Amino acid sequence: LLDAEDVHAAKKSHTHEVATYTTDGFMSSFDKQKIDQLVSPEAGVTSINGKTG
Amino acid sequence: TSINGKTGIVDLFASDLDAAEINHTHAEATTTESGFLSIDDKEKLDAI
Ligand SMILES: [Fe+3]
């Protein structure tokens, strides 16, 4: 009987570690939420009657 | 985050905060409620 490990092959349903400062790979899901927050943030009121701060 | 359910570029006014304008009129004075003096009452007072 053969399996993915028996032939030094990646499992049919396999996952990679999230990317780090030096190695690539997936991104963490909350990182995806973060970047989707950065683009089109609609975070609060940007200006109130032309006033900020 | 929001003011009165408004987000983003929002301009609020007196009626937006349930407030009265500078040039706003009240209910005229009657026999049961206090208010602005009517024109007829002022004319009658002046004539008397
Ligand atoms: Fe008033």
Side-chain angles (χ1 to χ4, degrees):
Chain A
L1 256 291
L2 283 295
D3 209 338
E5 206 282 334
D6 321 329
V7 298
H8 322 298
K11 164 81 60 203
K12 174 262 291 183
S13 177
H14 82 273
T15 61
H16 300 282
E17 311 86 300
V18 290
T20 86
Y21 278 27
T22 49
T23 180
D24 309 4
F26 292 174
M27 49 164 90
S28 85
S29 69
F30 98 106
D31 200 299
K32 168 74 159 114
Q33 283 159 168
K34 205 218 184 306
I35 169 181
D36 280 359
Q37 280 150 9
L38 272 291
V39 161
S40 77
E42 54 272 2
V45 159
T46 286
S47 86
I48 166 67
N49 194 87
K51 316 186 94 43
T52 58
Chain B
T1 68
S2 81
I3 311 158
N4 270 354
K6 314 151 192 214
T7 326
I9 309 306
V10 173
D11 310 327
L12 82 180
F13 304 121
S15 153
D16 301 0
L17 257 47
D18 300 325
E21 259 61 29
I22 279 301
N23 308 313
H24 70 290
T25 175
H26 299 254
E28 297 172 358
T30 61
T31 62
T32 54
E33 249 187 4
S34 302
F36 282 175
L37 181 83
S38 82
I39 288 163
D40 291 346
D41 289 332
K42 177 72 171 111
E43 280 184 343
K44 191 175 181 178
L45 196 55
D46 285 353
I48 283 162

